[PDB]
Amino acid sequence: EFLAKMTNGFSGADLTEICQRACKLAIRESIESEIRRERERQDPVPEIRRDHFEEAMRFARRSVSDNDIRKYEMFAQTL
Amino acid sequence: NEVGYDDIGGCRKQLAQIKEMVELPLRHPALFKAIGVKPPRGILLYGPPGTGKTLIARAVANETGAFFFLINGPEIMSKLAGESESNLRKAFEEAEKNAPAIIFIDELDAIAPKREKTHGEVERRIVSQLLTLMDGLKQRAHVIVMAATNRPNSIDPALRRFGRFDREVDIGIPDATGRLEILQIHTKNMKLADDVDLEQVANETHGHVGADLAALCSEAALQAIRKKMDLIEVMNSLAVTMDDFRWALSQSNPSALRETVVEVPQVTWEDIGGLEDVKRELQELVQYPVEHPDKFLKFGMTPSKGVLFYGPPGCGKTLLAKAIANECQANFISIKGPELLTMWFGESEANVREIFDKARQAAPCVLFFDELDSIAKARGGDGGGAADRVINQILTEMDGMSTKKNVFIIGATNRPDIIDPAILRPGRLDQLIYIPLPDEKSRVAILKANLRKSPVAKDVDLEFLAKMTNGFSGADLTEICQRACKLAIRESIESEIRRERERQDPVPEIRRDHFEEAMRFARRSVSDNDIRKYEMFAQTLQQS
Amino acid sequence: LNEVGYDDIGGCRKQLAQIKEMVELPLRHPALFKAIGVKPPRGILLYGPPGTGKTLIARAVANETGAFFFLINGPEIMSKLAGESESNLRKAFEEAEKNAPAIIFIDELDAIAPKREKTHGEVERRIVSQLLTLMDGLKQRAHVIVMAATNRPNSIDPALRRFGRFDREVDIGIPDATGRLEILQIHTKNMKLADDVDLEQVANETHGHVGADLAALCSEAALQAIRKKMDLIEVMNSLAVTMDDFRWALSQSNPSALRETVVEVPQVTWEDIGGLEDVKRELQELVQYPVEHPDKFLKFGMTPSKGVLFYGPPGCGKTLLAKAIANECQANFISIKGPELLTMWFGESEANVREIFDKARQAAPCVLFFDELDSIAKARGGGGAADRVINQILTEMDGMSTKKNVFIIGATNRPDIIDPAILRPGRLDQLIYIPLPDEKSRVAILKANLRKSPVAKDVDL
Numbered sequence A: 001e002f003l004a005k006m007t008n009g010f011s012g013a014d015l016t017e018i019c020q021r022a023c024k025l026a027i028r029e030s031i032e033s034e035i036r037r038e039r040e041r042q043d044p045v046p047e048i049r050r051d052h053f054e055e056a057m058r059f060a061r062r063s064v065s066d067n068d069i070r071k072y073e074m075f076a077q078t079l
Numbered sequence B: 001n002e003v004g005y006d007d008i009g010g011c012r013k014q015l016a017q018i019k020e021m022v023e024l025p026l027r028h029p030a031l032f033k034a035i036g037v038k039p040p041r042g043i044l045l046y047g048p049p050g051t052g053k054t055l056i057a058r059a060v061a062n063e064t065g066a067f068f069f070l071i072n073g074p075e076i077m078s079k080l081a082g083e084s085e086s087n088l089r090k091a092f093e094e095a096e097k098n099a100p101a102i103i104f105i106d107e108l109d110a111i112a113p114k115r116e117k118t119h120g121e122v123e124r125r126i127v128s129q130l131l132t133l134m135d136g137l138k139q140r141a142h143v144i145v146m147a148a149t150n151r152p153n154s155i156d157p158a159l160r161r162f163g164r165f166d167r168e169v170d171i172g173i174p175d176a177t178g179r180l181e182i183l184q185i186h187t188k189n190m191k192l193a194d195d196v197d198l199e200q201v202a203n204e205t206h207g208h209v210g211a212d213l214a215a216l217c218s219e220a221a222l223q224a225i226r227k228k229m230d231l232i233e234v235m236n237s238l239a240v241t242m243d244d245f246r247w248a249l250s251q252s253n254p255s256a257l258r259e260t261v262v263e264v265p266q267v268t269w270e271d272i273g274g275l276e277d278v279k280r281e282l283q284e285l286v287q288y289p290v291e292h293p294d295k296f297l298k299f300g301m302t303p304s305k306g307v308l309f310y311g312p313p314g315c316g317k318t319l320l321a322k323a324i325a326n327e328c329q330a331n332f333i334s335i336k337g338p339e340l341l342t343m344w345f346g347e348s349e350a351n352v353r354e355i356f357d358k359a360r361q362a363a364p365c366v367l368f369f370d371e372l373d374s375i376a377k378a379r380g381g382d383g384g385g386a387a388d389r390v391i392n393q394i395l396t397e398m399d400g401m402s403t404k405k406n407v408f409i410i411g412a413t414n415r416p417d418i419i420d421p422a423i424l425r426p427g428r429l430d431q432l433i434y435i436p437l438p439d440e441k442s443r444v445a446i447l448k449a450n451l452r453k454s455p456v457a458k459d460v461d462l463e464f465l466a467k468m469t470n471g472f473s474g475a476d477l478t479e480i481c482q483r484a485c486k487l488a489i490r491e492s493i494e495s496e497i498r499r500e501r502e503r504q505d506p507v508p509e510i511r512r513d514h515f516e517e518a519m520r521f522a523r524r525s526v527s528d529n530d531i532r533k534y535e536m537f538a539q540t541l542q543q544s
Numbered sequence C: 001l002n003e004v005g006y007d008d009i010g011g012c013r014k015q016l017a018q019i020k021e022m023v024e025l026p027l028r029h030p031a032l033f034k035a036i037g038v039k040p041p042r043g044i045l046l047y048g049p050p051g052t053g054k055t056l057i058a059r060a061v062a063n064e065t066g067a068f069f070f071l072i073n074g075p076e077i078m079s080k081l082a083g084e085s086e087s088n089l090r091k092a093f094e095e096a097e098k099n100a101p102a103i104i105f106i107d108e109l110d111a112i113a114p115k116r117e118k119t120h121g122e123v124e125r126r127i128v129s130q131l132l133t134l135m136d137g138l139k140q141r142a143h144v145i146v147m148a149a150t151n152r153p154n155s156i157d158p159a160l161r162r163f164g165r166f167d168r169e170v171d172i173g174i175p176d177a178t179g180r181l182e183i184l185q186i187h188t189k190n191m192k193l194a195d196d197v198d199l200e201q202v203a204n205e206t207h208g209h210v211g212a213d214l215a216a217l218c219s220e221a222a223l224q225a226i227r228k229k230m231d232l233i234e235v236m237n238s239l240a241v242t243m244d245d246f247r248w249a250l251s252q253s254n255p256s257a258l259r260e261t262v263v264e265v266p267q268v269t270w271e272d273i274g275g276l277e278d279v280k281r282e283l284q285e286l287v288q289y290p291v292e293h294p295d296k297f298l299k300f301g302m303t304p305s306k307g308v309l310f311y312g313p314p315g316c317g318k319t320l321l322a323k324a325i326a327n328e329c330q331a332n333f334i335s336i337k338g339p340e341l342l343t344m345w346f347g348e349s350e351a352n353v354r355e356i357f358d359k360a361r362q363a364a365p366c367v368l369f370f371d372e373l374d375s376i377a378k379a380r381g382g383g384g385a386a387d388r389v390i391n392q393i394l395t396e397m398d399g400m401s402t403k404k405n406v407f408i409i410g411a412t413n414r415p416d417i418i419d420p421a422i423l424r425p426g427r428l429d430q431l432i433y434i435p436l437p438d439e440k441s442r443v444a445i446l447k448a449n450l451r452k453s454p455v456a457k458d459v460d461l
Ligand SMILES: Nc1ncnc2c1ncn2[C@@H]1O[C@H](COP(=O)(O)OP(=O)(O)O)[C@@H](O)[C@H]1O
Pocket: B007, B008, B009, B010, B011, B048, B049, B050, B051, B052, B053, B054, B055, B056, B182, B185, B186, B209, B210, B211, B212, B214, C136, C164
């Protein structure tokens, strides 16, 4: 709910991209932990984390701009 | 050298289907008689070229106890009028009379051109005769007809409907396990070595189709033989090792991509200075999807696939592309901007379709759509009304009614503002990577990498050069180094010619005077206004 | 005595070794292959630019290999009757396999294998399907090797190009200096030429030739030598081709590839240009060092620069320098005016640009001269044909290519219009400025322009 409230101009594609980026960050952390564990030898992160979501929010972006979306409103107004 | 079901691998479901179909009715029709419904009596094998269709056909023919009849597609018709139909009738009647036999037609797309586009009356008559013979009155009893074709689309729907060719077994490309099994099958008959990693070879091999695995094995054997060229007690010790396996693997490319293979210069990640973030992101993006699919499946969402590079000209977009091509574990396809456009109507869309189909077939592949500016304008006095159609084709192919197994799209451009907003939408080109002009550390690294293999005197001050040059770019630094090298070579040539003339290694390393002279007239490549435009475009998106 | 042999092939060692390793060993002694276990390749395809020697290699292999040989001209299997082409092809293959472990050679198979998909007819489709099924299928091969030869292999079916039918596609590329020297030595084995000729030098000057043009040069030199004795035409035993004859033949001859782009050029030497000594020297170094001393560049481990741009007020010596280079430069020259490569058809302009650049790099080392660069490469901002062509030029000039050697010389007098992308270092790095003459430059140009003319001594320059 907080993420949705903060994001205003985003769209479903942007939200899906944020989720995918969070997943990629989680996988990167997991694989780094596993490789370090193996190296020291010779599921640390079972769930996506608030820090991962924070990074995704940090470097997410908006798909379309208000100036661009105005065109659809104008077309609807025309009819 | 008999070939049987033990000589085929990488196709379990399809092989099981064909096996049960060809055995159950033959081994005992009592069960099917008790059930009441007769089993199917027709199958069509379709797939990309060189997947194993003919191998399956010949294995079934040589292993089944029932009589087998073979009919090459372009073999029935003869000079005499009304002879192809007679030949077909004679073949079918002889086969059915002989025994509960099996008919195999190879490349029937040459004899069934859809019955609509064909012009010659012979083709229409033969296809109609085949249809009538397959489906008529009291036609067949205890006979199964096979098929094998590369283009199932160009077949008659009347022939493809149930009762003539009802089931279409898909013999597709294998996976890692399939490639491992195929390699085991091919290498079993030969004494390879005491130290081989077939699992590693299968992992490395990505877009091959079994026939290419056989080609790789043959190339490895040839390299092993040539390793004894000087020697040629040898045949006994002949073997193939990891060395020639790796050599053949490096030289091997999938048969599908033989059409669009172009040599590219060799470059390695150490050749690029700075851009640590971009390098790490590209490496992770191209590695994780094809390295740890289990984690992606467990988390439950497919990862990003597209990436776009936008920045001032002379930052290293093409250099990163070359590095990816040289040091990627996935097949690389290079396509220029307007290479897919032709004057004919719709042939540009046909080329786009076939290139994306090739990429999907050879997946995992990385597509480098260089000059997206040229490829796709924003939208639309149209110039032939084809740019819009091509752009729509690209959009729908990239994100439409498809699974999108594994195909990464990379775009390099320097005018992002003339790109259609749809392309930038997440899910197509979600990753917008910005490559700024190098800073002090980046310039130092770029110069050091550029001068990696060259005789350079110690008096040089790379830090001093980096501090002196502020707005320069990688291209500018490369040009400065090239100027220095040319001045050194000119000095060497003049000294050598003077010394030879006087008679009838003066300079072993480029020197500080050479660098000073070269830098005397260095010029910037990208203007303040252009860099400001790029930064503004970056800001309008970051602020979003 | 005139039969071509393996020694008759020159300028191709790696390709010849690749051909032999799979043509001779299986027929020489297959014991090693049997011991290894895996069968060797049984199909090869020769592809390269026209007139490289692929047909000569095929002829030598046919005339040297002991095993039975069979040949099939491509556009010759077809017959007027219906289905007769497949009958002929099947009979040829059957008799070839029955006779012995023979060799089948198909010449220009691209005329009988039209990709099976883009073709709209039916006879060609049936023929290609027959060929596919005949080479690959049940009862595949009785130890029979197939060969092919096409100048352009792209227009061939991918199924044909797949392993098992045509697996090894040896590329017979353009020769080098040593290859040209070997070709000249091979061709000049039946001439009482002289005791003073140095074929190495002639090979050095000969740059873009592809062997067939070397043969043409030798024939032209022989014709010149025989014509030189027209007055006397004791003569039969005195015939001989001299270094002067070779010089004349070399001066007259031009590479076959650049034949389509041959244009007359006025003869102007360096002395005809007044002043601009620094520009002349810099350009000479730029165009000479990469081709003259590549060893030093390799030692220094850096590729040389390949771009220069001429910009200045009209009437200063830009096109004059271009003419001087086209006349007195060792490398091949290609002159293209600005809008020559533009056509109304959709994409044909890009096709023309790609064709020209491919031809230039293929015939390298050559210097490509662009005139009205501001006209060809407009800034960025009728269907965007200008944008598409500029993008094509940029990408094919600095894309995923080896960029062997093509020097681009730019001439224009409106530099501001040209977009910054072209002027980036690495494409047209050198920005040479040609200003209006000073007093000394004016005196020098006057002297050069009055070099050959009757002028009274009273004239003061
Ligand atoms: N599943 C497989 N297992 C083992 N070898 C295979 C397999 N698929 C293909 N091959 C090898 O590659 C070749 C390609 O299959 P092939 O029967 O020629 O198919 P096609 O009829 O499409 O040309 C086979 O002849 C065989 O040598």
